[PDB]
Amino acid sequence: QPHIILIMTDQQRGDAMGCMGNESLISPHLDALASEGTLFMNGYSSCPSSTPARAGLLTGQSPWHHGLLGYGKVAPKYNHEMPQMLKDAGYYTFGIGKMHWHPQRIKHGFEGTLLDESGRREDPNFISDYRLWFQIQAPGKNPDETGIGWNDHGAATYKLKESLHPTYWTGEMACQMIQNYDNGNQPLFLKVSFARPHSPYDPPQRFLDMYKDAQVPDPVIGEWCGKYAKELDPEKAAKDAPYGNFGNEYARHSKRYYYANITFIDEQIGRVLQTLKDKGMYDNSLIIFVSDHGDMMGDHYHWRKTYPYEGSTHIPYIIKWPAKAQVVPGKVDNPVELRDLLPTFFEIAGTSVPTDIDGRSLLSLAKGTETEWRKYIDLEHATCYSDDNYWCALTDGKIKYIWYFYTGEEQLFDLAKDPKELHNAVNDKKYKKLLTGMRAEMIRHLSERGEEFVKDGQLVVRKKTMLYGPNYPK
Ligand SMILES: CC(=O)N[C@@H]1[C@@H](O)[C@H](O)[C@@H](COS(=O)(=O)O)O[C@H]1O
């Protein structure tokens, strides 16, 4: 069976790779990986915050089926779990970096994890393996010396050496494990999960310098986003503001520091891919690159995540297939989601997909032999940051329909003609047929949830937030 190398980052935008048509972003290692595999052009996170997206990843299930509908705790045990499935298939299973699991040191079938959980301390007496390692390298030093908060919109260069940075530690420990892999006939399942480019925007100077002459794209500003248009002083606003117009210059400054941290990650991913080649493991590895969700980075005067817009839900999505499986490198436009990785792994490991998994293997689609694929992927997020930010959406990456549970507002974006989502087309006479169709799809989607979500074939305005659905493990 092929090695499975699941590489991922936290809070990386789908548009933030060179191979996604971004001219100012330096990702030569990811661009090369994508050149040798399938670049999914419409990869989505269904629930754009760390823990529900990671539950979707872990279980191959929709938010309604794994039961976490927004920013909460991943359940300690699910019926189907990515690492346990592969262990049960005879894989040696290990995870390095961010799991964001509950408890933090739960394994879900991994033989071990080596954790960077950033500043989160949840288990009694918890210190991340990264932070214990840091004290060995630099005893009495402060891994947060740079002084930028975990949720900040501001930026600064890393105030420690590059070799103490969590991105270096993550790539370095993954490189050593691959370098030392000599486990007879047992295939490796390695998860490599970067905390970055989630805030802080704290790139080393060396990586910021790679952007000295770069012009990074402006934030995109829709006609509908008036509610957050007032120009504010970033030095006076909350350092972790989820909303704010700090001007285009401020947004481009933070975006440059964001892009520098992606280029740092991309260099570590380069080391991991070279180690695999050096060990002769690359060509019979399934290699995945994804993120759990995007970063709005000033788009529509939004910061952070948990919104339906492209900057929040559109994710990087690359598969380099085993050379044996005979996939021609290409692009797939169909809407794919984090839930589709576990069933792909089942097929590649040669285990039958259970019927209670929502994702669908991606191998046929990549081979252009798929006869049944979803029309639309469902997206949602439970109330986060503000009472109004509570929603469910459907998209194929050509149209997106958004239902705001708390306000009863609808939005409709023609992604084909309006990829930046500048124009809410919900009151456009030209879009009445498409809108009628998408409202019917949202009712079909939400009906299983019962009378608090759909009553007598109508969408229900909710006054209460459901964070944990009835399908959340008991
Ligand atoms: C939805 C959202 O914005 N979630 C963020 C996470 O992305 C972040 O990882 C965490 C850090 O917590 S901390 O270690 O206490 O700073 O703070 C939460 O608010």
Question: Ligand 1: which of 51, 74, 150 to mutate, judged by most atoms within 8 Å of the beta carbon?
Answer: 150
Domain 378-459 has what CATH class?
alpha beta
Nearest CA residue ID for atom 19, ligand 1? 151
Contact yes or no for 74/51 (Cβ under 8 A): yes
What are the b/e assignments for 299-330, b being 16+ CB within 10 Å? Answer: bbbbbbbbbbbbbbbbbbbbbbbbeeeebeee
- Give CA angle at 387 (381, 392), nearest 5°: 30
Contact yes or no for 44/313 (Cβ under 8 A): yes
Contact yes or no for 292/74 (Cβ under 8 A): no
- Name residue 290's beta-bridge partners: 8, 317
Give the CATH H-level superfamily of domain 3-367. Alkaline Phosphatase, subunit A (3.40.720.10)
Judged by phi (left if over 0) then psi (alpha if -120 to 50, else beta), residue 118 lies in left
**Cα 388 from Cα 402, distance rounded (Å):** 13
**Cα 253 from Cα 455, distance rounded (Å):** 47
Nearest CA residue ID for atom 15, ligand 1? 120
Write out the two tokens for 224.
């509908």
76 lines ligand 1 (CB under 6 A): no
**Cα 440 from Cα 408, distance rounded (Å):** 15
- Measured CA to CA in angstroms, residue 283 lies from 4, 279, 325 at distances of 11, 10, 10
Residue indicated by tokens 């074939």: 457
Amino acid at 13: R
Q: Are strands 410-414 and 399-404 parallel, antiparallel or unpaired?
A: antiparallel
307 lines ligand 1 (CB under 6 A): no
Nearest CA residue ID for atom 5, ligand 1? 151
Q: Compute, in angstroms, the gap from residue 316 CA to the centroid of ligand 1.
A: 21
Please give the sequence-ordered ranges of beta strands (E in DSSP) within 19-117, or none if there are none: 38-40, 43-44, 92-97, 112-115
**Cα 461 from Cα 388, distance rounded (Å):** 11
Peptide bond into 203 cis (omega under 30): no
- Measured CA to CA in angstroms, residue 442 lies from 126, 336, 376, 394, 424 at distances of 42, 18, 10, 7, 17
Q: CA torsion, points 376, 382, 388, 389, in degrees to nearest 10? A: -60
Amino acid at 37: G
Rounded to the nearest 10 degrees, the angle between the axes of helix 341-349 and helix 50-59 is 30
DSSP 83-105: HHHHHHTT-EEEEEE----SSTT
Atom of ligand 1 nearest to the CA of 11: 7
306 lines ligand 1 (CB under 6 A): yes
**Cα 185 from Cα 345, distance rounded (Å):** 18
Classified as helix, coil or strand, 92 is strand
Classified as helix, coil or strand, 197 is strand
- How was this entry determined? X-ray
Judged by phi (left if over 0) then psi (alpha if -120 to 50, else beta), residue 455 lies in beta
Q: Compute, in angstroms, the gap from residue 290 CA to the centroid of ligand 1.
A: 20
Write out the two tokens for 338.
């984090």
Q: Would the CATH topology of 3-367 be identical to that of 378-459?
A: no
DSSP 2-40: -EEEEEEEES--TT-SGGGT-TT---HHHHHHHHTSEEE
Among 159, 166, 118, residue whose Cα is nearest residue 141: 159
Question: Ligand 1: which of 49, 151, 199 to mutate, judged by most atoms within 8 Å of the beta carbon?
Answer: 151
- Name residue 243's beta-bridge partners: 302
Q: Compute, in angstroms, the gap from residue 122 CA to the centroid of ligand 1.
A: 12
What kind and span of H or E run contains 190?
Answer: strand 188-197
Among 310, 314, 306, residue whose Cα is nearest residue 388: 306
Classified as helix, coil or strand, 174 is helix
DSSP 342-396: HHHHHHHHT-PPPTT-----SHHHHHT--S---S-EEEEE-SBSBTT--EEEEE-
Contact yes or no for 304/200 (Cβ under 8 A): no
360 lines ligand 1 (CB under 6 A): no
Report which DSSP code applies to 248: H
Contact yes or no for 58/78 (Cβ under 8 A): yes
368 lines ligand 1 (CB under 6 A): no
Residue indicated by tokens 């590895």: 285
Q: Compute, in angstroms, the gap from residue 151 CA to the centroid of ligand 1.
A: 6
Atom of ligand 1 nearest to the CA of 119: 14
Q: Compute, in angstroms, the gap from residue 150 CA to the centroid of ligand 1.
A: 7
φ and ψ at residue 194, rounded to 5 degrees: -80, 135
Q: Compute, in angstroms, the gap from residue 49 CA to the centroid of ligand 1.
A: 9
Classified as helix, coil or strand, 138 is coil
Half-sphere exposure of 404 (CA within 13 A, CB side): 15
Nearest CA residue ID for atom 2, ligand 1? 49
Classified as helix, coil or strand, 331 is strand
Classified as helix, coil or strand, 148 is coil
**Cα 159 from Cα 43, distance rounded (Å):** 35
Nearest CA residue ID for atom 18, ligand 1? 151
What kind and span of H or E run contains 276?
Answer: helix 248-278
**What does the domain layout of the chain look like in residue ranges?**
3-367, 378-459
**Cα 5 from Cα 3, distance rounded (Å):** 6
50 lines ligand 1 (CB under 6 A): yes
Residue indicated by tokens 């409709």: 412
**Cα 325 from Cα 320, distance rounded (Å):** 10
300 lines ligand 1 (CB under 6 A): no
What kind and span of H or E run contains 259?
Answer: helix 248-278
φ and ψ at residue 229, rounded to 5 degrees: -80, -25
Report which DSSP code applies to 270: H
Contact yes or no for 1/90 (Cβ under 8 A): yes
